[PDB]
Write a protein that binds this ligand. Structure first.
Ligand SMILES: *[C@@H]1O[C@H](CO)[C@@H](O[C@H]2O[C@H](CO)[C@@H](O[C@H]3O[C@H](CO)[C@@H](O[C@H]4O[C@H](CO)[C@@H](O[C@H]5O[C@H](CO)[C@@H](O[C@H]6O[C@H](CO)[C@@H](O[C@H]7O[C@H](CO)[C@@H](O)[C@H](O)[C@H]7O)[C@H](O)[C@H]6O)[C@H](O)[C@H]5O)[C@H](O)[C@H]4O)[C@H](O)[C@H]3O)[C@H](O)[C@H]2O)[C@H](O)[C@H]1O
Ligand SMILES: *[C@@H]1O[C@H](CO)[C@@H](O[C@H]2O[C@H](CO)[C@@H](O[C@H]3O[C@H](CO)[C@@H](O[C@H]4O[C@H](CO)[C@@H](O[C@H]5O[C@H](CO)[C@@H](O[C@H]6O[C@H](CO)[C@@H](O[C@H]7O[C@H](CO)[C@@H](O)[C@H](O)[C@H]7O)[C@H](O)[C@H]6O)[C@H](O)[C@H]5O)[C@H](O)[C@H]4O)[C@H](O)[C@H]3O)[C@H](O)[C@H]2O)[C@H](O)[C@H]1O
Ligand SMILES: OC[C@H]1O[C@H](O[C@H]2[C@H](O)[C@@H](O)[C@@H](O[C@H]3[C@H](O)[C@@H](O)[C@@H](O)O[C@@H]3CO)O[C@@H]2CO)[C@H](O)[C@@H](O)[C@@H]1O
Ligand SMILES: OC[C@H]1O[C@H](O[C@H]2[C@H](O)[C@@H](O)[C@@H](O[C@H]3[C@H](O)[C@@H](O)[C@@H](O)O[C@@H]3CO)O[C@@H]2CO)[C@H](O)[C@@H](O)[C@@H]1O
Ligand SMILES: OC[C@H]1O[C@H](O[C@H]2[C@H](O)[C@@H](O)[C@@H](O[C@H]3[C@H](O)[C@@H](O)[C@@H](O)O[C@@H]3CO)O[C@@H]2CO)[C@H](O)[C@@H](O)[C@@H]1O
Ligand SMILES: OC[C@H]1O[C@H](O)[C@H](O)[C@@H](O)[C@@H]1O
Lengths: 801, 792
């Protein structure tokens, strides 16, 4: 009955005799009055659970240091196994050896995959230790043979770190989440390793959290106020380890979309872990990073991958969920086959109530413990899909043994199709997925920003209609990307009209609510989610870590992923790109000229649109992956911030981008929570108020008011020919040049900085005064301008100085 | 030895000697040191030499009078006397007695009056009134013994030769190749009269010297002076109803004496110095021009004199030999091809020789470099001849002759003695021939204003004697003015020709169907000349200012005549305005006209003031105004409110630095090519508003030039020259100083490089945007792909 009562297992050279303990909280926690360590882990299906303890030396030799088997009657309440250890030695790490049935051993129990030869990881582990250093192979052991822990050299035994002692807690120094209004954000999408891994970073600890801190100043000076980190939860970079043919380079799991543990920071991004620090060092190093971001005005948004795990399918390794309770954690068919909506091996059983709670807890854990500001949910559609349910295992009354069940205990239709227990066939996209409801409504998370990549690998696309619970979710707007890429490169079809919509924050998606005639989601489950949102629901992007780099969108018609080892079958097939006249690096002046313009024209579309822009690390200076549009597996300069190329800025593109960011941020009209109307914005062409929406259009142009008598004139000429634009006349006022991608840098962006003085800017405005007074502006093919309304001053046409 | 001629000595000289007829004028006998006086009159009966102290001259009174013996003191029609040991501070004239036609109708054309004392045509210096605008004395003119005509025309006298020659310090005329000239038409008083000039002696030869560095810095290498031969600025002295101000003869197109420099442009004469002081003041001016590589070209007026018609004053020729010196009908009426009252008898032999002697004088004595011939057509016309006077061998008295001795046809029409009707324009005028062939003048430039007031126009075919003559090209003016304002018609085509040095006017051997001169007297002159035959101008002292032809549709001459068809456009409003679009457009058009002028083959001339936007407030004939209308506004030049003076200055230097525009032969199709919005696709239609051309430098480089005269802007596809890109230099659509991208005190070489780079994407695309009513000049340069990287 009582938690303090000893449970029978004897003391050791490193702990007191075990006590009963408690179900809550899940994970390992410090008991407050005794100082002891309570362990709690869920499994509905395990027959036995042992807590396994390791020193690092023993961990590395594939052996346990101590084992404590839990009594199934004492050390268990419902489905939560638990035990407590006083005087536990700090140099020890922990896991669980879970015994039960496996389907390959007995057909009658499909979905069960217990294996006592493995020691599995606590899902709620605060920190994980296995391999200390990025890219370091696991130790050479006789894996597979009796008594040795670990799957293979690329998957050695891992273990969880004990909770920190009372009195030892992080000095936040009064740090808090920043809660910046969403519409005010400029998101930079970044990878922790790649941010400083290149020799040119010059940081003390390349490719780490601490390293990232040394170069955070550059981001603040760039004008960014949010950073979105690619997956930061423990993953195994050696999981795709193999040789690249034609090379001695080896491929890795670099990006990290394959999560081993969701509660622990990636240890092989921690400088301290590389230097031999205890496993929790990653925790405090990550905290430090978040503190440093916040000091600099930068929010932290974590890319989280709750739709599949590193365990893959049946052929993958057993490291956590599979060996604890495979039927609970993964989405399974009645035979035990893994659903593969992720396209990565398995699908997490998101709406199953234990799993739901896991995810809730996880998000609260990162917000509360690490002061994070938001999450970006990889393939978020899978979080809408209905789970697989199994009946609770029924045991024999007299015998105590295990009783087999109709359909293995899978809850099915009369036709055998799998079900969520509540009458919904497994996989069905729910209009009201209870996981998403809980995320949207949990008080701990109420000021936390949520962003959905609203699609998955089974062709489900929910953009415009992700279950958003009152405007509580924004979305990666891939239609924006497609529209901007198409319109800017110069293309027939609806792209001018669509581009104008993109510029306005895509009201055609988020405000409008009449669905496509053949779109099943929008006509059914998504129906109620279709309006009731603003332009800030749209995360706008032209490029991401996925797909072509900005520079490569203008240098490559086609992808070149041969080095990825899926023989070019991977990555986006339709990039809507144009090489500007020749594939890859060229010597032709005409083509390079054009690319310099196109890069800026695309950036202009991005930073001059309503909604919320996101920039892919590197795109702000011309970064190239040599035409590889899916560099998930390369630990090389293809995925690193080129501090050397940034400094060089050979055509002044970084200056242009920086300055446009700052300008965007100084322009309230661009940062809205409600959609612009005809008083806010007007559309033009070669003549004022005469836009071209035809299929052959190559021009979109508009005025944007500032509600103080001023505003901007913006134009995108996507023709192969130059044009003379007649500008709308605002009485008493004249348009003044600011942006012009026709001009060689620095005259492509007329604002004061280290390169152009106030005098230089005024001189450059006066030069054109005859043109602007005339309300006439010449534009180059494939070019972009931004002008500002100023009070007319007839003295502008007299001699300058 | 010259025999004594019998006249007594006096306090001022010794017993007179006979003297010689040569040289004409007053001169020093090399043998005795005596002053020899010589003077032509075939018609006179008596001639007395009259001498004046300055005091006596001022009081209308002669100090001495020496009657000449008609036998001993005369050889042929030349009267002469020598006076030894003459007080050199006296001045001289002649009292000439003879018949007058009003006192006797039998002698039409004779206008002797012995109450007058007339000036030596060959006078080296004249004294009459010492200061500009100074009224003559208030004498009882017309009464017995009082000399002078009225207060505006008091008695003049001529100075004697000096017995201390000027120090030229090796000065010679510069003999610059004609094709290298940029000419500045200027007026000696107007140049420094304005308070802002800040000179010691405003409005004088000495004052002009003090500001010549301005002209050198401007890049001008020839100055053409409005008439510096003595004239009477009080000829038109009269009050202007509007104002306090009086009307003058300001410009000076009404000469009193052709051999004397205008005394009232001399600071020294105005200060009481002897009359000769102006000779040295003028020599100093020429010397100082030459030190600065500036040539001196004199505007000369040999087609008429200040004596007007029969209602004007007898001061010189009329009283000496009216019949010789003036073009007369058989009743003694004054032909008036000049539109001024008289016509000088240019091709009669004594007259011819006078003009020639005059030109030689100014070249030899004053080191002048060239002449501009006012209404030069008049010098091509046949003169009027009269039989030599007949006297009774018995009585000695005059004999009347048939027709008054006029040499007429059977129908009574006047003739030149050799069968040509008086006034007929000659293919081979001996005066123009002599000018063209005389060795003294062989390296002297000659410029004809080849028309006159009876509608004779000879441009394209002035008798030029192997290209010895250039001409004011009035076609250029009209064409450039019409093309640049935007005007339907043949203007684009004519403008292209104007740019080529007007070969349609000077090398075109095919004359018009109707033009008499070209089909007859001028036929032999219709070719054999290069573009340097054409003196190009957009404006001159006559007509509208550059500024004003862009600000006024119609003239405004109330305060006074003046051109009626000006081909101007005010750019949207008459005169001054606050409308911004008008002022902007005027600023461009000033540059656009000046560009047409300075980017054309031939020889450009700039009218004083037009390099800073000088205005005459819409008055297009300011001949009678001694005021800031005709003064160089040093204050306004200093202000340069929209950088127009800078623009002009640079354009002039750039032109001098461009051999391709300074030619003695005409451009062919290898030299120049004609483009439009597309390369090699010009528009010659009646609605054309664009002319553009490439001009080779002979080294693989060259210029792209274009004038958009449309009201709409254009995009221009430039012609692609392999391995090369066009760089911006001139763009009249850019606000100064970016209208002219050249290094000076305002733009660094850094500034220029950066201005060029800005546009590297436009030029590499071979695409150039131009504003309406604008003009650009680009410069072919080797292609540098790195131009489009960061300027840095
Ligand atoms: C938003 O969303 C997406 C997705 O989240 C992001 O997309 C990017 O990231 C993706 C994931 O990184 C990436 O996809 C690529 O990887 C996945 C796998 O994660 C691939 O998925 C398919 O193919 C794999 C591999 O064929 C299948 O895996 C199954 O089979 C293998 C067995 O072949 C199992 O591997 C396991 O066992 C092997 C063998 O024992 C282990 O390898 C070991 O031995 C080898 C030699 O024999 C050695 O080479 C190796 O070093 C040893 O370790 C291995 O470690 C172990 O995992 C799997 O477990 C099993 O599931 C999948 O079933 C199948 O779906 C894709 O094809 C790849 O493209 C995307 O391209 C990225 O774009 C996106 O970025 C986000 O925005
Ligand atoms: C090249 O080509 C041309 C021409 O060379 C240049 O053109 C410019 O210069 C022109 C010449 O300066 C200028 O023309 C203007 O002036 C001329 C004359 O020089 C005019 O010619 C016509 O009209 C006049 C005036 O009616 C005629 O004059 C004749 O009659 C008058 C009147 O009697 C005579 O005047 C003489 O008599 C009176 C007697 O009392 C004297 O006046 C005095 O009393 C006045 C009051 O009662 C006082 O006010 C006055 O101050 C007193 O002195 C007068 O002084 C005296 O001379 C004339 O002698 C007699 O011939 C002409 O015959 C007739 O042809 C033009 O009409 C004028 O426009 C042009 O406008 C310029 O553009 C050009 O610049 C070059 O490219
Ligand atoms: O140069 C003359 C030509 O220019 C214009 O066509 C260009 C397009 O604007 C430009 O986007 C690109 O088109 C490519 C598509 O974007 C790409 O998806 C793929 O299909 O290849 C196309 C080119 O190979 O390039 C073309 C021209 O190269 C203009 O639209 C034409 O009308 C014009 O004749
Ligand atoms: O005026 C404010 C208005 O701006 C935006 O509307 C523009 C659209 O984005 C744009 O596509 C275009 O719409 C036209 C279609 O493209 C065309 O095919 C045809 O059907 O006509 C449509 C209407 O013109 O132009 C509109 C502006 O007229 C924004 O989307 C609006 O919500 C906003 O109110
Ligand atoms: O290219 C060398 C050539 O240039 C100049 O000739 C141009 C003329 O100046 C210009 O008027 C124009 O002539 C055209 C007429 O206006 C038109 O009405 C019709 O008759 O055709 C004419 C041309 O075909 O163009 C010519 C250039 O062709 C200049 O006159 C010469 O010095 C030189 O030979
Ligand atoms: O399912 C995968 C795909 O879904 C969506 O249709 C997106 O447009 C695409 O970018 C994404 O990768």
């Amino acid at each position: 009955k009582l938690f303090c009562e000893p449970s029978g297992q004897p003391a050791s050279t490193a702990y007191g005799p075990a006590l009963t303990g408690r179900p809550a909280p899940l994970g390992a926690s410090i008991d407050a009055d005794t100082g002891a360590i309570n362990f709690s882990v869920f499994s509905s299906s395990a027959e036995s659970v042992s807590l396994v303890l390791f020193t690092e030396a023993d961990l590395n030799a594939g052996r346990a240091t101590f084992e404590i088997p839990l009594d199934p009657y004492v050390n268990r309440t419902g489905d939560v196994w638990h035990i407590m250890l006083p005087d536990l030695r700090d140099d020890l790490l922990y896991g669980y050896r879970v015994e039960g049935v496996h389907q390959e051993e007995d057909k009658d129990y499909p979905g069960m995959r217990h294996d006592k030869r493995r020691v599995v990881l606590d899902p709620y582990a605060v920190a994980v230790l296995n391999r200390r250093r990025w890219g370091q192979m696991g130790p050479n052991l006789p894996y597979g043979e009796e008594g040795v822990l670990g799957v293979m050299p690329t998957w050695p035994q891992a273990a969880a770190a004990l909770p920190a002692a009372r009195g030892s807690a992080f000095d936040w120094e009064g740090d808090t989440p920043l809660n910046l209004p969403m519409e005010s954000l400029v998101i930079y999408e970044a990878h922790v390793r790649g941010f400083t891994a290149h020799a040119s970073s010059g940081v003390a600890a390349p490719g780490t959290y601490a390293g990232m801190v040394e170069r955070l100043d550059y981001l603040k000076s760039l004008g960014v106020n949010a950073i979105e980190l690619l997956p930061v939860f423990e993953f195994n970079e050696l999981e795709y380890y193999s040789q690249i043919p034609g090379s001695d380079q080896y491929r890795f799991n670099f990006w990290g979309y394959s999560t081993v543990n969701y509660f622990s920071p990636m240890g092989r991004f921690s400088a301290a872990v590389g230097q031999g620090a205890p496993a929790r060092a990653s925790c405090d190093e990550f905290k430090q990073l978040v503190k440093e971001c916040h000091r600099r005005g930068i929010e932290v948004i974590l890319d989280v991958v709750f739709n599949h795990t590193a365990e893959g399918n049946e052929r993958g390794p057993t490291i956590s969920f599979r060996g604890l309770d495979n039927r609970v954690y993964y989405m399974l068919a009645p035979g035990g086959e893994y659903y593969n909506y992720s396209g990565c091996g398995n699908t997490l059983n998101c709406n199953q109530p234990v799993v739901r709670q896991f995810i809730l807890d996880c998000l609260k854990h990162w917000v509360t413990e690490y002061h994070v500001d938001g999450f970006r949910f990889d393939l978020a559609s899978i979080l809408t899909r209905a789970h697989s349910a199994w009946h609770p295992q029924q045991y024999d009354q007299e015998t105590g043994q295990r009783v087999a069940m109709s359909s293995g205990g899978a809850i099915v239709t009369a036709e055998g199709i799998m079900t969520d227990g509540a009458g919904v066939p497994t996989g069905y996209p729910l209009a009201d997925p209870p996981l998403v409801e809980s995320i949207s409504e949990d008080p701990v998370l109420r000021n936390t920003k949520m962003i959905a990549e609203a699609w998955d690998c089974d062709g489900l696309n929910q953009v415009g209609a992700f279950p958003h619970y009152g405007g509580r979710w924004s979305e990666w707007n891939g239609k924006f990307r497609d529209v901007v890429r198409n319109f800017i490169k110069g293309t027939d079809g609806p792209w001018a009209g669509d581009f104008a919509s993109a510029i306005c924050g895509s009201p055609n998606i988020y405000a409008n609510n009449t669905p496509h005639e053949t779109d099943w989601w929008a006509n059914n489950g998504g129906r109620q989610w279709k309006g009731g949102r603003g332009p800030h629901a749209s995360i706008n992007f032209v490029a991401a870590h996925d797909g072509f780099t900005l520079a490569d969108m203008v240098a490559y018609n086609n992808k070149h992923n041969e080095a990825n080892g899926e023989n070019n079958r991977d990555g986006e097939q339709h990039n809507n790109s144009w090489n500007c006249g020749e594939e890859g690096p060229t010597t032709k002046w005409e083509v390079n000229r054009l690319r310099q313009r196109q890069m800026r024209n695309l950036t202009g579309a991005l930073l001059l649109s309503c909604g919320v822009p996101m920039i892919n690390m590197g795109d702000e200076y011309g970064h190239s992956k040599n035409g590889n549009n899916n560099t998930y597996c390369h630990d090389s300069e293809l995925n690193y911030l080129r501090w050397d190329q940034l400094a060089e800025d050979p055509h002044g593109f970084n200056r242009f981008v920086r300055l446009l960011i700052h300008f965007r941020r100084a322009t309230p009209a661009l940062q809205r929570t409600t959609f612009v109307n005809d008083k806010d914005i007007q559309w033009h062409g070669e003549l004022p108020n005469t836009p071209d929406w035809t299929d052959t259009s190559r021009l979109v142009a508009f005025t944007l008011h500032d509600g103080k008598g001023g505003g901007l004139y913006v134009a995108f000429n996507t023709s192969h020919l130059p044009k003379l634009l007649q500008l709308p006349k605002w009485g008493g006022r004249v348009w003044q040049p600011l942006v012009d991608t026709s001009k060689v840098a620095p005259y492509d962006f007329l604002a004061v900085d280290g390169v152009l003085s106030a005098e230089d800017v005024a001189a450059a405005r006066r030069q054109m005064a005859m043109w602007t007074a005339d309300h006439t502006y010449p534009v180059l093919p494939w070019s972009c301008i931004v002008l500002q309304s100023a009070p007319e001053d007839p003295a502008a046409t007299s001699m300058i100085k």
